[PDB]
Amino acid sequence: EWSYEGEKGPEHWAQLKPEFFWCKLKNQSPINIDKKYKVKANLPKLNLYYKTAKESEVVNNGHTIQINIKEDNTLNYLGEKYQLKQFHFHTPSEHTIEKKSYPLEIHFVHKTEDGKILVVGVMAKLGKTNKELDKILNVAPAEEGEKILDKNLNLNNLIPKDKRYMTYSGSLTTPPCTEGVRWIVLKKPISISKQQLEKLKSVMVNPNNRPVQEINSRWIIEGF
Amino acid sequence: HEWSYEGEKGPEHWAQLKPEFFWCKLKNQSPINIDKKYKVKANLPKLNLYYKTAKESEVVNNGHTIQINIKEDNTLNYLGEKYQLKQFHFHTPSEHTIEKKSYPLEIHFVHKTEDGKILVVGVMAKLGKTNKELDKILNVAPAEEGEKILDKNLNLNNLIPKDKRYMTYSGSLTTPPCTEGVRWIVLKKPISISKQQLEKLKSVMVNPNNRPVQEINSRWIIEGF
Ligand SMILES: CC(=O)Nc1nnc(S(N)(=O)=O)s1
Ligand SMILES: CC(=O)Nc1nnc(S(N)(=O)=O)s1
Ligand SMILES: [Zn+2]
Ligand SMILES: [Zn+2]
């Protein structure tokens, strides 16, 4: 077990279990997207276009609020077939952009049959209410537990229509912090209402963002 | 030796030889195959690479390669960091491959900042015109593990192409401990060495001494305009 505070906090993760050794390495996430270590180049188109999510499972695992997806969605990227497994929340955001923090960051976790992991991160700023998020928050357990959502979700409405993104090689932001993770962070944020942010914080442990990590020898590539 | 390119201490076993070699089995290892599929072209920092004449440099045969330790203090300024050249050595055949293509020789110029940041510049060599600088090195390079101090000066710049355009990615040392967080810079244009020079090098240096290419995993390679 680990947490975001105390002796089980981020600074002590690598010491909690032998399998968490990754947490202290050189290609960790999240990071601050710094212009100094960023280049601009044409990157592969990001084609998500998820299927409607029916009877998805909303889980409170003591670390975040996660939504497990039942349908088989395929994200074709660099010839690999990534399957969306779930998406979850972090408040405040884990990545920062030019030191700017967002009240919410959404992670859509995908994995290929052979284990390759690709996470799509979406920032959210306070603004207009997001219709999909209310469906999730209305049934999200305030304590560790799981609940099946009776309403369908249009996952595409939790992602900006404009798919321009930045990418870099990183890791999982929670123990074991495994590296070799392909990170894709959307440039444009979506919006959520103050009310939704308050509601999320009333049911999810927070703050639950890992401190930004050292960039080391990595370059961030921002697409067009 | 603590590790080798063959046998029980070979590449696939490095990580299991010592706790300090755990890096060798991770996700951001070098060398790699430079494949267009995982590469983009962009505006990268200009590579200002020029070395001082190397005088009385030490040529060492450490059983893993032929390494030249220079006495001078050369600084490579990159991204606000000041990297000092520590030494350069050889690999045959090449460690990195370009679009599946292998070169007879790859030269590594290893630099490190004061705070431990490692930057290795790799230069490929294709068979062709003989390289005079290489001859000075080969003429004194120990055939058996040992060391020999050069009396002649070396112009390291003649082992580097005039065209400084390069490709870069985040990787590791290609030999144990295989530490990651290494900044790799591979020149696009190769230099040339005569077939005879390659034969001479293989007569004194352990070969093949190239580590198998590693999985690219979630990395991108960037080539500068
Ligand atoms: C099984 C699984 O997906 N685990 C994750 N752990 N951290 C993740 S994150 N915050 O990097 O998206 S995903
Ligand atoms: C002390 C030192 O420089 N060690 C190195 N180990 N591998 C290197 S390489 N082949 O990646 O240039 S340099
Ligand atoms: Zn996450
Ligand atoms: Zn080397």
Evaluate: CB of B172 within 6 angstroms of ligand 2.
no
Domain B1-225 is in which class?
alpha beta
| Cβ pair B184, B28 in contact under 8 A | no
d(CA A222, CA B193): 39
Helix (H) or strand (E) holding A89: strand A80-90
Domain boundaries of chain B, sorted by first residue:
1-225
If one looks up domain A1-224 in CATH, what number appears? 3.10.200.10
| Cβ pair A86, A66 in contact under 8 A | yes
d(CA A44, CA A167): 11
Per DSSP, helices labelled H in A10-159 are: 13-16, 131-137
| Interchain CB distance below 8 Å, A36 and B79 | yes
Closest CA to B167 of B91, B88, B220: B220
Closest CA to B35 of B218, B216, B224: B216
d(CA A101, CA A70): 31
CA B180 to ligand 4 centroid distance, Å: 14
3-state helix vs strand vs coil in chain B, percent to 5: 20, 35, 45
Which of A35, A36, A40, A169 to mutate against chain B (most B CBs within 10 Å)?
A169
| Interchain CB distance below 8 Å, B41 and A41 | yes
CA A133, A135, A137 angle in degrees (round to 5)? 65
- What does residue B210 show for φ and ψ, rounded to 5 degrees? -105, 135
Task: Say which experimental method was used.
Answer: X-ray
CA B203, B123, B102 angle in degrees (round to 5)? 70
Q: What is the CA radius of gyration of chain A?
A: 17
Q: Please indicate if any CB of chain B lies within 8 Å of the CB of A152.
A: no
Closest CA to B168 of B125, B87, B225: B225
| Cβ pair A62, A205 in contact under 8 A | yes
Residue carrying structure tokens 């591979």: B186
Per DSSP, helices labelled H in chain A are: 13-16, 131-137, 194-203
| Interchain CB distance below 8 Å, B168 and A219 | yes
Indicate the residue of B44, B182, B217 with minimum beta-carbon distance to A217.
Answer: B182
| Cβ pair B93, B103 in contact under 8 A | yes
| Interchain CB distance below 8 Å, A27 and B181 | yes
Strand runs labelled E in B30-165: 33-34, 39-42, 58-61, 66-69, 75-78, 81-91, 97-98, 105-112, 118-127, 146-149
Which residue of A lies nearest to B42 if distances are taken between CA atoms? A41
CA A200 to chain centre: 15
d(CA A185, CA A178): 18
Q: Please indicate if any CB of chain B lies within 8 Å of the CB of A24.
A: no
User: In sequence order, which residues have a C-beta less than 8 Å from that of residue A217 and are 6 or more positions away?
Assistant: A26, B117, B118, B119, B170, B171, B181, B182, B183, B184
Query: How many CB atoms lie under 10 A from the CB of residue B49?
Result: 21
Nearest protein Cα to ligand 2, atom 8: B173
Selected residues 31-70 of chain B with any CB under 8 Å from a CB in chain A: 37-38, 40-44
User: In sequence order, which residues have a C-beta less than 8 Å from that of residue B8 and are 6 or more positions away?
Assistant: none
Judged by phi (left if over 0) then psi (alpha if -120 to 50, else beta), residue A115 lies in left
How many CB pairs (< 8 A) connect A and B? Answer: 77
Indicate the residue of A167, A181, A216 with minimum beta-carbon distance to B181.
Answer: A216
Would you say the C-alpha torsion A189, A193, A198, A199 has a positive or negative sign? negative
Indicate the residue of A36, A180, A217 with minimum beta-carbon distance to B183.
Answer: A217
d(CA A153, CA A70): 11
| Ligand index nearest the alpha carbon of residue A30 | 1
Nearest protein Cα to ligand 1, atom 5: A172
Pairing of strands A220-222, A165-171: antiparallel
| Deposited resolution, Å | 1.8
Which residue of A lies nearest to B224 if distances are taken between CA atoms? A39
Q: Which of B2, B91, B105, B173 to mutate to test the pocket of ligand 2 (most atoms within 8 A of CB)?
A: B173
